Amino acid sequence: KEMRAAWISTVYNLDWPKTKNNEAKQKKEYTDLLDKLKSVGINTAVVQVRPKSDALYKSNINPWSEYLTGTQGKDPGYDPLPFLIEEAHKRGMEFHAWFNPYRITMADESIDKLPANHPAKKNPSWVVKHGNKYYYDPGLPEVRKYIVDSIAEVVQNYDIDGVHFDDYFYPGVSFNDTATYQKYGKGQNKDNWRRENVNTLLRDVKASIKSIKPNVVFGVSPAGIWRNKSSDPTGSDTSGNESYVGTYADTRAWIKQGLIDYVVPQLYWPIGLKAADYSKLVAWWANEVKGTNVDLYIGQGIYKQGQSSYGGQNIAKEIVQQVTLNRKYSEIKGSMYFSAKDIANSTSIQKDLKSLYS
Ligand SMILES: [Cl-]
């Protein structure tokens, strides 16, 4: 059946939970949200279980997420994840656990204030500062193993249907990994080595998942441009930021090597936008997966509703037009909507999705 997913982001309490330190209210906020999503045809919840090197689940590896209580590491008095999963399943909805692999801190947060048992505190060798934030080093084999193991815990212990990574990889062109490169890089072009570091993580996460539960899917949602045609003649007829260059996310390699089961390019632009034309990009991405077994879903930017903050771009108003176009491409297998709150908070969006999905 067609994929009809919504992202439920927990970072900064974006979509869920609205309330901290109140188990009953958090539970009701979630079921009410699922009910509204189901009512418009959403069949899959993609829920951020690791927003910030943390866990919205009981873990022997990673600390409780601050977004449940206000305090990182604080036990909220229940494990939310069984509830999040079981309530999705009772409504006939699939559940994909979404992880951010490398993030550790937000801007200006002190690394020294993490909980004692935090992996980044126990393993200072793993941590790289970039600007005013800290990250796990994608180039360390121990870091990759730790991420694999962190996901494997969730696969083993919870009835998930999928594992999902979003679009954050290396945080910028530069990154203070010279020592890592010297030790492990074999003199390879450094940027190619960084791309391969990310590829290796994806490969190893997929393999781990399959060795436990073969039918659990693994997917990634990268940024919507891989390379512009101006950098690579087989790239897209677009301008602006490229995932290949800017975060070392080589989505084409992932597809060609079968490192993922599904891919969700974030096409958060209107049809006709010169720099990043939705209509050109759906075609480009459909062609990328042709002849592979990688499922293509389009990331839909319904959060853009004409605000000046987005230069007046209004994706929500044209969502029927976008999905109608998607459906012209047999390689496109559905959509993921950013984000759940936008569906919940808008009667117009609800009406449009009902008309697409009923
Ligand atoms: Cl290898």
Author numbering: 30 to 387
Task: Show me the paper's own sentences about this structure.
Here, we present the high resolution structure of the functional region of one such protein, Cwp19 along with preliminary functional characterisation of the predicted glycoside hydrolase.
